[PDB]
Amino acid sequence: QIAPGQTGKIADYNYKLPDDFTGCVIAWNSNNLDSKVGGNYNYRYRLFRKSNLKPFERDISTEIYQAGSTPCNGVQGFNCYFPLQSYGFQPTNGVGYQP
Amino acid sequence: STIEEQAKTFLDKFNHEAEDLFYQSSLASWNYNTNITEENVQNMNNAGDKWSAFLKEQSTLAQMYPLQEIQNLTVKLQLQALQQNGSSVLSEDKSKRLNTILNTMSTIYSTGKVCNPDNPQECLLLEPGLNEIMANSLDYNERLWAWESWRSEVGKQLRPLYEEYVVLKNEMARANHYEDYGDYWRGDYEVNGVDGYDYSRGQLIEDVEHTFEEIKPLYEHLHAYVRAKLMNAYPSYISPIGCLPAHLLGDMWGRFWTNLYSLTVPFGQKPNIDVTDAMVDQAWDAQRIFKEAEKFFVSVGLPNMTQGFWENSMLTDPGNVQKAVCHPTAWDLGKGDFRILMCTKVTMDDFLTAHHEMGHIQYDMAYAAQPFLLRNGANEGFHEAVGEIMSLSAATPKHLKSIGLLSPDFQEDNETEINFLLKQALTIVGTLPFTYMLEKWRWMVFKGEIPKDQWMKKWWEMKREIVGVVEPVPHDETYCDPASLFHVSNDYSFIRYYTRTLYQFQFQEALCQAAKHEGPLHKCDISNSTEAGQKLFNMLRLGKSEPWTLALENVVGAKNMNVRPLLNYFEPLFTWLKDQNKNSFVGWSTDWSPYAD
């Protein structure tokens, strides 16, 4: 999902590449370092956002996400969720989902 | 603003939280089965309860999103399972007492045993003890002692525990707006929301009953042939138009007749196909057994196995220090982690079982891209059906000669294949009557059509009419036959085995039409053919996200189950059995009994 004019959860709600982006991409398997026995929750992500992030925009706001019109006020409940979610990391996970 | 947006939001966050707890719950069971330790036994309960209570907590929020305002089919299917409250609908007492009955009935099954009448000191448990002895036992009294005495302390003692299981489970179906508990299992086939593909729950009783009528002419000939070979042993108790004893079926419950293949061999003067002696000379181990099967899925176009799959496999049991269950099982946890726990010896069955155990893993790879709640087979019969089509292709002499197991000069003719069809017929044609018989009985008892006193009266009354089996010793309503069965005592679906036979054969006939194979069906081999894999891969990745009636049309082109592929694959055997039964009477009568003369 990382590329000019892409879509998806991580692209829209986390990191997006503008259509004119001239840079490059590099990735390698971290399963031998990040992933450990029992799981590593230190690496999280933003699951829900009221809209799509703009090009080269970073928002760390932890404010609760409101799905409907039901007030939240920072208290989890019906139609109220916590946007940040932790990536499950263990060495037994499939290569496709390896960090 | 609309409930649709709120429903999809609840479903997106549910897959992530459920995938983490579900993976840890299944991972805990893996370490418990691979190694028996005090730490793994507790981890399975903690991880199992954490995931079990997760659905109970999510079910409360799932009932707050009615499905009437959701116009998406994929959204309602995900919430269809979450809308169910499980045991929450039951009363506090009925909810807690239900687990006690399941654990009590399951404990007596494993702890149940029958002491040797001749050796009161030695007392052998049913599994393996009672299941192994009854397999090769040719004695009339030896088989009757363990078969008759088991249900005395089991069937009779499990009757009060089974009665509660019937009343408790019914309260759950009524709270779910189901006609009865019997309709609860039929809900797996329920199809609604698509015009023209709708499948009613009650339609299953008519399909299973309508398709069984066409199997009668094939089973009647197969039953008359088995009774002719065994008629010389006991002509008094075995009548020509009567039924065969219930304890002579070859095992405890008479589920599979494969054990009788030895004495039922039509031709003993010709060799049989076996890879045991061939693999020994080739010097192959469990490491190369799975590797040879992995190349088979690649020939049809299916992706290979991940590196972690073959590295984490368990090829044997390292003694009693670290012990595991040798029962072949395909464990799918999540996050791309696939493993198989089996004890791998050198045999012709392990090679065929390798393709079956790998079929489940290969089947889980197609729909793995679907949501957590959308990852599953279209029904309960497609799980083991997709794995049987792979084993049927390996048992063909063409596939064995390809890799070099069977000699290239081996003569293949009618005498050679006729003996092979009989071996597969006992395991296939033998389970069908027993499956429709036992499954139909549970639906009648749960529906309330059979009073408590007629449970056993209707059990054997319908047994001679369906499978044509009579009881040597008459039993009263105290005994419970299904109570001793594994699936009946463990609260598992017993109907999935009947439909598996019709589904595995439909794909066999459809996949062979894409590969353009000619000749008999049992001669077909899907290896080296990449056209059949592309057609089956479409449905493999669909899972239960789409109605099984629609997905089945894209493969075999049928909207329901059909027995036609059952007659063609068994056609060569039916033509031969019809001639051998001319001197005997085809069929049986329900008015004959071994104790009634």
DSSP annotation string for B153-178:
HTHHHHHHHHHHHHHHHHHHHHHTT-
Interface contact B16, partner A, CB < 8 A? yes
Element (H, E) at B42: helix B38-62
| Closest by Cβ to B61, choosing from A48, A78, A90 | A78
The verdict on a CB contact (< 8 Å) between A93 and B337 is yes
B206-211 own/partner pairs: CB under 8 Å, 24+ apart: B207/B560, B207/B561, B208/B436, B208/B439, B208/B440, B208/B495, B208/B498, B208/B499, B209/B436, B209/B440, B211/B502, B211/B561, B211/B562, B211/B563
Q: From the CA of A40, how many Å to the nearest CA of chain B?
A: 12
Torsion angle of alpha carbons B41, B45, B48, B51, nearest 10°? -140
Say if residues B424 and B430 touch (Cβ distance below 8 Å).
no
- B536-557 burial by CB neighbour count: b if 16+ within 10 A, else e? bbebbebbbbbbbbbbbeebbe
Query: CA-CA distance, B278 to B405, in Å (whole number)?
Result: 6
Cβ neighbours of B279 (radius 10 Å): 19
Say if residues B338 and B332 touch (Cβ distance below 8 Å).
yes
Enumerate the known binding-site residues of B for Zn(2+). Answer: 356, 360, 384
Query: CA-CA distance, B531 to B481, in Å (whole number)?
Result: 47
DSSP letter at B478 equals T
**Nearest chain A residue to B309, by CA:** A94
The verdict on a CB contact (< 8 Å) between A93 and B5 is no
The verdict on a CB contact (< 8 Å) between B13 and A81 is yes
Instruction: Taking the CA atoms of B552, B554, B555 and B558 in sequence, report the sign of the dihedral they define.
Output: positive
Interface contact B369, partner A, CB < 8 A? no
Interface contact B336, partner A, CB < 8 A? yes
> Half-sphere exposure of B571 toward its Cβ, with a 13 Å CA cutoff?
12
Angle at alpha carbon of residue B384, lines to B291 and B496, rounded to 5°:
170
- B138-172 burial by CB neighbour count: b if 16+ within 10 A, else e? eeeebbbbbbbebbeebbebbbebbebbeebbbbb
Query: CA-CA distance, B131 to B327, in Å (whole number)?
Result: 14
Cβ neighbours of A7 (radius 10 Å): 11
Return the closest-CA partner of residue B218 out of B424, B390, B381.
Answer: B424
Cβ neighbours of A13 in B, within 8 Å = none
Element (H, E) at B470: strand B469-470
Return the closest-CA partner of residue B405 out of B502, B292, B308.
Answer: B292
- B30-50 burial by CB neighbour count: b if 16+ within 10 A, else e? bbbbbeeeeebeebbeebbee
The verdict on a CB contact (< 8 Å) between A79 and B335 is no
Residue type, A21: F
Query: CA-CA distance, B450 to B459, in Å (whole number)?
Result: 10
Query: CA-CA distance, B306 to B294, in Å (whole number)?
Result: 10
Q: Residue B123, SS3?
A: strand
The verdict on a CB contact (< 8 Å) between A94 and B306 is yes
Query: CA-CA distance, B116 to B124, in Å (whole number)?
Result: 7
Query: CA-CA distance, B5 to A68, in Å (whole number)?
Result: 8
Which of B20, B29, B31, B306 is the best substitution to test chain A (most A C-beta atoms within 10 A)? B20
Q: What are the backbone angles phi and psi of residue B199, rounded to the nearest 5°?
A: -125, 115
| Tokens 């190369």 -> residue | B288
The verdict on a CB contact (< 8 Å) between A85 and B16 is yes
Those residues with Cβ within 8 angstroms of residue B519's Cβ, 6 or more apart along the chain or in another chain: none
Residue type, B463: K
Say if residues A91 and A31 touch (Cβ distance below 8 Å).
yes
Residue type, B436: Y
Quote the tokens at residue B310: 């073959």
The verdict on a CB contact (< 8 Å) between B335 and A85 is no
Enumerate the known binding-site residues of B for substrate. Answer: 255, 327-328, 497
Q: From the CA of B1, how many Å to the nearest CA of chain A?
A: 6
Interface contact B311, partner A, CB < 8 A? no
Distances (CA, A) of A46 to A3, A40, A50, B254, B293: 19, 16, 11, 57, 42
Angle between helices B571-580 and B203-229 (to 10 degrees): 50
Query: CA-CA distance, B176 to B168, in Å (whole number)?
Result: 13
Number of separate domains in chain B: 1
DSSP letter at B127 equals I
Quote the tokens at residue B171: 């309260």
Query: CA-CA distance, B119 to B374, in Å (whole number)?
Result: 54
Q: How far is CA B406 from the centre of its chain?
A: 30
**Nearest chain A residue to B61, by CA:** A78
Which of A13, A35, A95 is the best substitution to test chain B (most B C-beta atoms within 10 A)? A95
Residues 23-52 of B with CB under 8 A from A: 23, 27
Query: CA-CA distance, A67 to A83, in Å (whole number)?
Result: 11
Rg (CA), chain A: 16
Q: What are the backbone angles phi and psi of residue B236, rounded to the nearest 5°?
A: -70, -50
| Closest by Cβ to A78, choosing from B64, B337, B338 | B64
The verdict on a CB contact (< 8 Å) between A95 and B23 is no
Q: Residue B397, SS3?
A: helix
Those residues with Cβ within 8 angstroms of residue A97's Cβ, 6 or more apart along the chain or in another chain: A88, B335, B336
Return the closest-CA partner of residue B505 out of B577, B571, B440, B564.
Answer: B564
Distances (CA, A) of B137 to B54, B143, B146, B423: 48, 7, 11, 19
Interface contact B312, partner A, CB < 8 A? yes
Enumerate the known binding-site residues of B. Answer: 151, 255, 327-328, 356, 360, 384, 459, 463, 497
Quote the tokens at residue B221: 């000939």
Interface contact A87, partner B, CB < 8 A? no
Those residues with Cβ within 8 angstroms of residue B575's Cβ, 6 or more apart along the chain or in another chain: none
Discontinuities in chain A (C→N > 2.5 Å), after residue: none
Return the closest-CA partner of residue B31 out of B337, B357, B245.
Answer: B337
The verdict on a CB contact (< 8 Å) between A90 and B335 is yes
B377: domain range?
A: 1-596
DSSP letter at B326 equals -
DSSP letter at A87 equals P
- Name residue A66's beta-bridge partners: A80
| Tokens 């370490």 -> residue | B31
Quote the tokens at residue B140: 């009339």
For B543-590, give the secondary structure using H, E and C.
Answer: CCCCCHHHHHHCCCCCCCCCCHHHHHHCHHHHHHHHHHCCCCCCCCCC
Angle at alpha carbon of residue B443, lines to B439 and B444, rounded to 5°:
120
**Nearest chain A residue to B311, by CA:** A92
Query: CA-CA distance, A93 to B15, in Å (whole number)?
Result: 16
- Name residue B124's beta-bridge partners: B114
Return the closest-CA partner of residue A83 out of A59, A57, A56, A55.
Answer: A59
Quote the tokens at residue B497: 């085995």
Those residues with Cβ within 8 angstroms of residue B579's Cβ, 6 or more apart along the chain or in another chain: none
- Kindly list the catalytic residues of B: 357, 487
Quote the tokens at residue B527: 């290896």
| Closest by Cβ to B12, choosing from A47, A95, A96 | A47
Cβ neighbours of B16 in A, within 8 Å = 47, 85
Query: CA-CA distance, B366 to B376, in Å (whole number)?
Result: 10
Query: CA-CA distance, B502 to B500, in Å (whole number)?
Result: 6
Q: From the CA of A51, how many Å to the nearest CA of chain B?
A: 13
Cis amide leading into B128 (omega within 30): yes
Torsion angle of alpha carbons B277, B279, B280, B283, nearest 10°? 160
The verdict on a CB contact (< 8 Å) between B336 and A94 is yes
DSSP letter at A64 equals P
Q: From the CA of B16, how many Å to the nearest CA of chain A?
A: 8
